Design a protein around this ligand. Structure first.
Ligand SMILES: Nc1ncnc2c1ncn2[C@@H]1O[C@H](COP(=O)(O)OP(=O)(O)OP(=O)(O)O)[C@@H](O)[C@H]1O
Ligand SMILES: Nc1ncnc2c1ncn2[C@@H]1O[C@H](COP(=O)(O)OP(=O)(O)O)[C@@H](O)[C@H]1O
Ligand SMILES: Nc1ncnc2c1ncn2[C@@H]1O[C@H](COP(=O)(O)OP(=O)(O)O)[C@@H](O)[C@H]1O
Ligand SMILES: [Mg+2]
Ligand SMILES: [Mg+2]
Ligand SMILES: [Mg+2]
Lengths: 387, 372, 372
């Protein structure tokens, strides 16, 4: 009946229908092959040939996990085919031929990835409709706003896109190659500082949950260095699901610091706030307020504790240092407002669900199966002529 | 006739309204905007084009264009678009029930007359219309039967000496220098301060800079020499984006282009040499009153202190044996509209309109036969 | 006087060498590299900042950033460091003896020129110096005196028409599209093939790729249609790593921005239309001659096949009765330097230097009363 919407994110998969509010099902984009190591390997129920999704992440102890998507693109495609099969056949267990699907994709992906993903979706499933939309416009839809710049930070890659009054500035879209996965890798290294080693595959998800529960974004660097240098209050105790406890100190505020200082992970690209400032400044002089006045955080990786406050303070400070050249006279004449909606993690899904019935009931807006087969790959231009 | 409409299709601004009134309900820059960014977002009905105050408000994304340049028209499609805007949006009156008054500068090519009159005929089917020169209304607004005028606008500046109901056609000349060229030179001189303005949207803010932070000096060499201690003349302008502008000698350099056109590669007589030549080419018996019956009109003459400089300069060129005066009404900008309304308010002007019955057999060429 | 020095501080590269010669003594990128690793290697004297060819050699670890932005210097400290490096490494002559010569973009914010001459007189003690626009040097390079110079480099591009004797300042057009923007757009479109370049050293690698494997299409839609069968437009490159890069229509898509600025979202007219407008602004007495001579100069204009498309499109815009030729010197990269050397070699130029003796009592503003 209602069109289906799919958000195949790098670290998670969300799926649902139109008019929905919260994602119907969310599960990591993982594929589990069976493996036997030096564990106890209790035979809970059974181990099948290929286990993916919630069952995979639950039985992860006895299986190795491979991530089909890296850096926002699909590395190995057979595993990702298994992922769509799982999602369509048991997560929703409804697999008609001819339904309408609205896909998602970060802005500056290779053409081949999107083209062959659409080809797979057509041929292997036979769906009668398709549409691929940027996550940024969906994030904009989530709050119903029309003008403003929205930043999306996920597991794979963080991107920002400025939109002013229902016009997407395709020549100023952002792409910062630092995301939650890089933060997790830096967390693993920072734990290797002390002596703890996480070289298994389930340990990756373990430390991901650790960073989920404990790590936080600093608001004042020198204050937190003083706190971690003189006081032991920052120490937290975390017990692994295996049952072992470790000590975490400065790692809590040093893990997500790589987002703001990418040189920690060996990235030449500027930090989050600096990149946002450059993107806003490169725009025309007329829309600069509405770019500053409405900055919307989105994505799972933006859920860091104390991130909106640090972002607002840092953007104001950087404006003061870069424009006013140290003059504090005109500082109180600046209006910046970072949006921090509670569901900025599923803003992409919410925007996709809204767009599902925004443009429904008229198939002449997107691509059909016949049009695809008789205009080849080049038929995939009705969606958008983005750069 | 119920009501009479008068409209002066000026190069930058368009003024329209019912005759016999004082406040124009239809004033807005002659701007046609089109979305430059091809990529658009589905929904909310992205309009194909924008015109008027709406276009000015959304100047950030569009690429605004001026249908009129130097007075000649190049964008007749935009002409019908803006005329439709004027007739329907902000007047709410059906065009086919009221007469219209049209204006333009002298020495306009005849084909312009033909096309404007012909589109007035078919595209709108208005009852009747008349077209004349802007300077005629400029003088008629003041209620003066004789005196030279200087109609400086956004794209046209022309001098029209006027006798008792007539004029000396050998004595009218029109100068292309106007607000557009002033804006261009202002950009070319503000590139000094590091400020850059290339996009049309930035042209629209350069125009505001000129409107609000410009004045005319009285003795350019002396004041430029004393500007070496640039402390009492520099001002501050707040750009829309949020920074500040420290305007300097360019706040008075750009309007000086009118007096000396040699700074824009225009080897032409100055704004006072043109007046001197025009009056000297007039009759000897009217040199006396033409020396002291000059008026200011249009939006270009809003410069503070330009009247005193113009008066003293034309006095310097003129013989000192007799007195010189200047007339600068505080409504120079709407003088043309007021004159048009007054002329259409004439008790006996209803028979000088041109209804359908003439064009039903005559054709567009008869406008030069009677209308002027 | 022993000799003379010419240093064209371009946005990307610096061509410094003695006058009276056709081969530059030293040409190298204008990059100041500072390492981003606190893990100092104790010993073997590695210095805090790297400039010149050493920056290119060690770009694997430094953070390369140009000290010129669109022809405007913004990091005067690294500017003076570069000048120090030049004078006492690649020239090995103290500036106290040999006078220098500099080049400046037209319509440049003159605070740049003032600070330039001030800092040179302060920290270099040059006996004398001069500043000239690259356009006049480009015109002098071919030995003629007519034509309009299309000088496009790393920061900005500009056109300055000129007849025998005197130039036409009101017709000078300048656009910021240049080699840096071309490299940026090439990097932006390379990610559509899966190849990602983010670091500054990667920017240099992409710039080398653009040097080696780029050309301008004769007809854009025709070549795009030809791109249906990936036969001839497809080439390969060898990365310094050892990788292999496959390049397609991006070979000719990125130089197209010179003619379609909307590709990178810059509202403007392509350089061909800019040249056409600039020549049209000239009077009828001068364009009949300026059409024939079109001087092409700069690093960007070295593209293979750009001259043919330039010629065909300029004749497309111009009336069909015109004969237009494009000048394509095989030494266009150093054309500005050769023009400067020729200008300095003339014995009729020693009179209008800028000596310290006149500078002391006139201050830094003398650069405006002397040069132009
Ligand atoms: N409260 C939190 N604190 C820290 N990190 C969080 C929090 N919530 C979510 N995250 C991070 O967000 C990530 C999930 O992001 P999500 O899967 O929605 O992005 P994505 O859709 O994969 O991005 P893309 O569309 O670019 O692939 C997780 O890897 C997790 O580390
Ligand atoms: N307050 C002001 N101060 C200075 N100049 C002004 C002011 N208002 C308008 N102008 C100038 O007047 C011009 C508008 O002229 P306009 O009345 O539109 O002539 P026309 O009606 O013939 O097109 C603008 O270019 C602007 O530069
Ligand atoms: N052979 C070439 N083909 C195409 N582009 C080139 C070539 N050589 C140099 N360039 C471009 O020209 C630029 C250098 O221009 P340059 O002459 O240094 O201008 P400027 O002196 O104003 O910096 C470089 O950024 C490069 O991208
Ligand atoms: Mg996402
Ligand atoms: Mg007028
Ligand atoms: Mg140069």
């Amino acid at each position: 009946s209602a069109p289906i919407v799919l958000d195949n994110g790098t670290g998670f998969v969300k799926v649902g229908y139109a008019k929905d509010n919260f994602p119907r099902f969310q599960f990591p984009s993982i594929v589990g092959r069976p493996i036997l190591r030096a564990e106890e390997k209790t035979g809970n129920v059974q181990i099948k040939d290929v286990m993916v999704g919630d069952e995979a992440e639950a039985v992860r102890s006895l299986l190795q996990v491979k991530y089909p998507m890296e850096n926002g693109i699909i590395r190995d495609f057979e595993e990702m085919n298994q992922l769509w099969d799982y999602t369509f056949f048991e997560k929703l267990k409804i697999d008609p031929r001819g339904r309408k699907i609205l896909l998602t994709e970060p802005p500056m992906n290779p053409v081949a990835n999107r083209e062959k993903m659409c080809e797979t979706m057509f041929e292997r499933y036979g769906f009668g409709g398709v549409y691929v939309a940027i996550q940024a416009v969906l994030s904009l839809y989530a709050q119903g706003l029309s003008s403003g710049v929205v930043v999306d930070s996920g597991d794979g890659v963080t991107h920002i896109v400025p939109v002013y009054e229902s016009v997407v500035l395709n020549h100023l879209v952002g792409r910062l190659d630092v995301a939650g996965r890089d933060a997790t890798r830096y967390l693993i290294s920072l734990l290797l500082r002390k002596g703890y080693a996480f070289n298994r595959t389930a340990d990756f998800e373990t430390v991901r949950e650790m960073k989920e529960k404990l790590c936080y974004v600093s608001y004042d660097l020198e204050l937190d260095h003083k706190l971690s240098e003189e006081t032991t209050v920052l120490m937290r105790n975390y017990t692994l699901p295996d049952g072992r406890v470790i000590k975490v100190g400065s790692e809590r505020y040093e893990c997500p610091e790589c987002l703001f200082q990418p040189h920690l992970v060996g990235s030449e690209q500027p930090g989050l706030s600096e990149f946002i400032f450059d993107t806003i400044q490169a725009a025309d002089v007329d829309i600069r307020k509405y770019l500053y006045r409405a900055i919307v955080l989105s994505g799972g990786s933006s859920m860091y504790a104390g991130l909106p406050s640090r972002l607002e303070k840092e953007i104001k400070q950087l404006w003061f240092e870069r424009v006013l050249h140290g003059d504090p006279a005109r500082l109180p004449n600046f209006k910046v407002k970072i949006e921090d909606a509670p569901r900025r993690r599923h803003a992409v899904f919410i925007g996709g669900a809204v767009l599902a019935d925004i443009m429904a009931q008229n198939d002449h807006m997107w691509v059909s199966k016949a049009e695809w087969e008789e205009y080849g790959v080049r038929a995939l231009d009705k969606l958008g002529p983005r750069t | 006739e119920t009501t009479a409409l008068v409209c002066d299709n000026g190069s930058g601004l368009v003024k329209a309204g019912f005759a016999g009134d004082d406040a124009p309900r239809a004033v807005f820059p002659s701007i046609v905007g089109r979305p430059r960014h091809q990529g658009v977002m589905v929904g909310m009905g992205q309009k194909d084009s924008y015109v008027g105050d709406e276009a000015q408000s959304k100047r950030g994304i569009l690429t605004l264009k001026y249908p009129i340049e130097h007075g000649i028209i190049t964008n007749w499609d935009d002409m019908e678009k803006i005329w439709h805007h004027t007739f329907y949006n902000e007047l709410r009156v059906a065009p086919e029930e009221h007469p219209t008054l049209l204006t333009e500068a002298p020495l306009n090519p005849k084909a312009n007359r033909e096309k404007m009159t012909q589109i007035m005929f078919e595209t709108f089917n208005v009852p009747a219309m008349y077209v004349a020169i802007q300077a005629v209304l400029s003088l008629y607004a003041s209620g003066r039967t004789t005196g030279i005028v200087l109609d400086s606008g956004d794209g046209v500046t022309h001098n029209v000496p006027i006798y008792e109901g007539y004029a000396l056609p050998h004595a009218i000349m029109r100068l292309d220098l106007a607000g557009r060229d002033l804006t261009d030179y202002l950009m070319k001189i503000l590139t000094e301060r590091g400020y850059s303005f290339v996009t049309t949207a930035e042209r629209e803010i350069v125009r505001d800079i000129k409107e609000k932070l410009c004045y005319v000096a009285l003795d350019f060499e002396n004041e430029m020499a004393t500007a070496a201690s640039s402390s009492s003349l520099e001002k501050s302008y707040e750009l829309p984006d949020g920074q500040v502008i420290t305007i300097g000698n360019e706040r008075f350099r750009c309007p000086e282009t009118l007096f000396q056109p040699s700074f824009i590669g225009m080897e032409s007589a100055g704004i006072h040499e043109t007046t001197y030549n025009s009056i000297m080419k007039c009759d000897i018996d009217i040199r006396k009153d033409l020396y002291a019956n000059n008026v200011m009109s249009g939006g270009t003459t809003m410069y503070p202190g330009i009247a005193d400089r113009m008066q003293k300069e034309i006095t310097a060129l003129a013989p000192s044996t007799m007195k010189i005066k200047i007339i600068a009404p505080p409504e120079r900008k709407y003088s043309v509209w007021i004159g048009g309304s007054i002329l259409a308010s004439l008790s006996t002007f209803q028979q000088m309109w041109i209804t359908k019955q003439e064009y039903d057999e005559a054709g567009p060429s008869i406008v030069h036969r009677k209308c002027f």
